[PDB]
Structure 1
Amino acid sequence: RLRSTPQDELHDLLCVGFGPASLAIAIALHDALDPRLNKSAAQPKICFLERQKQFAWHSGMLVPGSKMQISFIKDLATLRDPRSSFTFLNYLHQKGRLIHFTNLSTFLPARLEFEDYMRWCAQQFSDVVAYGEEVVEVIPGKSDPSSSVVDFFTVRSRNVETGEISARRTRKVVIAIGGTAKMPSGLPQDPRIIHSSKYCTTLPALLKDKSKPYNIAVLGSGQSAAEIFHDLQKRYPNSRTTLIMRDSAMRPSDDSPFVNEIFNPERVDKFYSQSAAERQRSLLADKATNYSVVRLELIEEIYNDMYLQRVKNPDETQWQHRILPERKITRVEHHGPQSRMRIHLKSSKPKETLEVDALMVATGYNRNAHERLLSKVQHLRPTGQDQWKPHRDYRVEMDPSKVSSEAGIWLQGCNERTHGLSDSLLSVLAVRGGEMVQSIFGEQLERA
């Protein structure tokens, strides 16, 4: 069991964010310290800062009926050690549900179930996690101020409820803050225009009456757009929905066994060793495994609904739920006296008008939010560097004549270009957590 470190003490590690990636590190550290699992093994002074009030995993996209797109074996522990108490199967055993899960004959739990698994995991680390704390900046520190050597970092976080800044000092920092909502530059700001990440949380507040005949539009062609589009038909039974996509069709995610091997934990070494050109070419060739793609079973379900509409009415323009392929939004009118916005559409090749009460935007995420937190440490990078360069062990490159060997900053979840498509996913977290514990607490736990 991990014990709390007083705020005023110098930490060994401070992690920013407590989502899956950070939780995987916490679990890996527990396991590395467990004399039952690690026969070799003073507790390291560790703390996790999370802006949410309690543990949650993409709560705004927890659509009813939504399933995991990954095998349960690729949970937070199994691929590193199946004997771990933090496995999904052990979770089910602790819940009295293992025999019942077995009878489902599925590798893909509901997202709701997998979130509770991770919640059950996270709760066992409550003593070392500070919730309601949003990190605003990371600042370099010098134990000897008159020297020119940085040997610690001050991490400042704002309390979400109360608003005051708190400071914690640490030798090492991990940033695992996921991504920020990516919005098209052409779209204007409006409370009726909502990103996919806030679908379950903000949309019901805007459209209070669930029986009212609303017009709701969805922009995108990926898993989130398909999930939202399909869900709206259940959540708002009398609403007219529209899916808008640049591509000609919803295209299936590629989970075929040979292609799927790029997500193997050991393939991170092979991917990282490749040159920039070889890494850029590889990500593009395997784009159908993660980006702008939908699980085949969802596509088929949607297509079936589209076919039943055809049975009832051969006239496509009369359909309650429609898909408009090869379209882009030219302009949005949202200053009119009516409840609805006017969306203007044209061909996406190098058209109609829609009037809608709400526009759901499922255009993915940006993984650049760490830049804002690390502006004050940019000068510690090697001369001329304008991007953070993560090593194989995820430790960012810094000038060794400016930064002590005991001090470092690690990045997690934003290292796709260097580590592969599995970097932002749950695929390698169990193994990566294990690697991270070794990279950070290596020398400290070698003597045991």
Structure 2
Amino acid sequence: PRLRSTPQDELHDLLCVGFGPASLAIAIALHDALDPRLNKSASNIHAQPKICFLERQKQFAWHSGMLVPGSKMQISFIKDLATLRDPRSSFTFLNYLHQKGRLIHFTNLSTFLPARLEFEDYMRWCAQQFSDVVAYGEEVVEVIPGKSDPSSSVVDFFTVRSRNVETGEISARRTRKVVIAIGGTAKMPSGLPQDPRIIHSSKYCTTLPALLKDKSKPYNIAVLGSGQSAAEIFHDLQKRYPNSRTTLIMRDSAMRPSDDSPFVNEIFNPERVDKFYSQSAAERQRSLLADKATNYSVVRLELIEEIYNDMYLQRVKNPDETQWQHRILPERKITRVEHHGPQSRMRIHLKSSKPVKETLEVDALMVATGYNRNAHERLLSKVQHLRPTGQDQWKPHRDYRVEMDPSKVSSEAGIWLQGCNERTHGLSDSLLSVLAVRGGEMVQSIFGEQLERAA
């Protein structure tokens, strides 16, 4: 039962902004809900809901700028887009492998962590089966309220305006229910200035080979940060730029291992979202901060040991640490950046991150400083008045539905948020952890009435 197209001029049941892992999980869960074989009920639905997905990328891609060669998953394959909701689903990773004639070969690796490339292709293979309801090259620029009865004081739909990435004109689609699943934006430090030589990690594979077109040149590249991205870049820079001198700049004293130990990893359990959301604001803030080592500013141990083993080989050859080709500079901060000099190389000034150190001259600076999740704020400007009086923060309910004033907004209308709700739903929110079950829940939250007609 493939999801059939809805003409743009028609009132949709659902419009999802973005078609990343989060949205794909919702589409996969809708497919399954409407599948009469996974749901006995689904036989008596017949009428397919009017759903549309808008993605600003040309096709499906999963962090293309960070697809570093050899890079692995930070999560078991069992936490794919379907399995935890229903292992029977056609969209499980194992069934993807089987459909590729590769399942037996994978088994022989004996790994729960597939290559980031392979997993992208898995999520690519899922994405293609919804190409009839996904409009690519469409960047959403704002969501606007609407009224079936213009004279009334009740909002019952939303107009969603999207700029065409190629042609540039704005098209508009009307829906009763809206989902924003747009992921993170590159978070840059404020002290750093704008320069084509200062590049965020998210754009590593895509915009750096353009700048340093010669993989043979003896460049000077620097990497800011101490999380998974910084490590992956720093480690790759050795391989991709064999004659270049690399420098790792971090305010912390060392890269710290990500926590995946079985007892800690319980916070990521799909069922724990209920128990997390139940907790008081002070207890959520206490939990995220305590469990930070599972997600943020941390590196997979095997890569920490790998980076270290390389560093040790440099010692075997040269006892003088200052003479190494690849160097780590712990407890440092960037204070001054000279990027107006005639040469190719900027001049980075460094100080101790503890309460003047060296100076570096670099052709490029990879800034692996993480992501912000406040992008939806810009999209929901025109809909802010629909919240209760006083609300400057969007408040998402358990089912991820933003709180709105019930006297201003019809119950058939509403906006959902997906990816940013870490403060309320837990650390598993921004990741792949619960997407399968979250997708299942979302389909029920949004199409509950419709699916109950057959149930």
TM range (shorter): over 0.9
Task: Give, in angstroms, the shift of residue 347 of structure 1.
Answer: 0.2
- The residue number in structure 2 matching 1:355 is 361
Deviations 1:128-148 (A, max 9, x none): 000000000000000000000
- Residues 22-54 of structure 1, C-alpha deviations (whole Å, 9 max, x = no match): 000000000000000011110000000000000
How far 1:421 sits from its partner (Å)? 0.5
Q: CA deviation at 1:306?
A: 0.2
Q: What is the SS of the residue equivalent to 2:8?
A: coil
Structure-2 separation of matches of 1:322 and 1:52: 36
Normalising by structure 1, we get a TM-score of: 1.00
Q: Distance in 2 between matches of 1:168 and 1:391?
A: 25
Query: Which residue in 2 is equivalent to 1:329?
Result: 334
Shift of 1:191: 0.2
Q: Displacement of 1:155 after TM fit?
A: 0.2
Superimposed CA distance per residue, residues 369-415 of structure 1 (whole angstroms, 9 cap, x where no aligned partner) = 00000000000000000010000000000000000000000000000
Q: Secondary structure at the match of 1:127?
A: coil
Q: Matches of 1:167 and 1:233 in 2, distance apart?
A: 47
Secondary structure of 1:226's aligned partner: helix
Q: Secondary structure at the match of 2:444?
A: helix
2:95 to 82, 85, 90: 90
SS in 2 for 1:392: coil
Residue-by-residue CA offset, 1:65-116 (whole Å, 9 max, x unaligned): 0000100000000000000000000000000000000000000000000000
Residue deviations 1:270-326, cap 9 Å, x none? 000001000000000001000100000000000000000000000000000000000
Deviation at 1:221, TM superposition (A): 0.2
Q: Determine helix, strand or coil for the equivalent of 1:213.
A: coil
Deviation at 1:169, TM superposition (A): 0.1
Secondary structure of residue in 2 paired with 1:14: strand
Shift of 1:3: 0.2
Shift, 1:121, TM fit: 0.2
Deviations 1:345-371 (A, max 9, x none): 000001000000000000000000000
- Alignment partner, residue 180 of structure 1: 185
- Cα distance between partner residues in 1 of 2:170 and 2:338: 41
Q: Secondary structure at the match of 1:338?
A: coil
Q: Determine the C-alpha separation between the residues in 1 that align with 2:226 and 2:167.
A: 40
Superposition CA RMSD, Å:
0.3
Structure 1 CA distance for aligned equivalents of residues 325 and 22 of structure 2: 41
Matched, 1:197 2:202: yes
| SS of match in other structure, 1:92 | helix
Identical-residue share of aligned pairs (%): 100
Runs of 4+ in 1 over 3 A off after TM superposition: none
Instruction: Name 2:159's counterpart in structure 1.
Output: 154
Q: Deviations over 1:397-443 (max 9, x none)?
A: 00000000000000000000000001000000000000000000001
Task: State the alpha-carbon separation in 1 of the partners of residues 441 and 390 from structure 2.
Answer: 29
- Counterpart residue number, 1:280: 285
Measure how far apart 1:184 and its partner are: 0.1
The CA deviation string for residues 179-227 of structure 1, in whole angstroms up to 9 with x for no partner, is 1100000000000000000000000000000010000000000000000
Name the SS of the counterpart of 1:263 in structure 2. Answer: coil
What 5-or-longer segments of structure 2 have no aligned partner?
none
**Structure 2 CA distance for aligned equivalents of residues 316 and 259 of structure 1:** 37
Matched with 1:28 is 29
Determine helix, strand or coil for the equivalent of 1:148: coil
Task: Please report the TM-score for the alignment, with normalisation by the length of structure 2.
Answer: 0.98
Deviation at 1:269, TM superposition (A): 0.3
Deviation of 1:336 after TM superposition, in Å, equals 0.5
How far apart are the structure 2 equivalents of 1:214 and 1:69?
31
Paired with 1:108 and 1:370, the residues of 2 have a C-alpha distance of 31
Q: How far apart, CA to CA, are the structure 2 residues paired with 1:220 and 1:396?
A: 34
- Give secondary structure in 2 for the equivalent of 1:130: strand
Q: Can you list the C-alpha shifts for 1:119-174, whole angstroms capped at 9, x where unaligned?
A: 00000000000000000000000000000000000000000000001000000000
| SS in structure 1 at match of 2:399 | coil
User: Do residues 413 (structure 1) and 414 (structure 2) align?
Assistant: no
Alignment of 1:36-435 (within 5 A): 36-41=37-42, 42-350=47-355, 351-435=357-441
- The Cα of 1:444 is off from its aligned counterpart by 1.1
User: Distance in 2 between the 1:340 and 1:241 partners?
Assistant: 13
Distance in 2, Cα, partners of 1:329 & 1:160? 35
> CA separation in 1, counterparts of 2:289 and 2:166?
43
Q: Distance in 2 between matches of 1:335 and 1:244?
A: 21
Q: Deviations over 1:222-247 (max 9, x none)?
A: 00000000000000000000000000
Distance 2:56 2:343 in 1: 37
Query: What is the alpha-carbon distance in structure 2 between the residues aligned to residue 166 and residue 39 of structure 1?
Result: 38
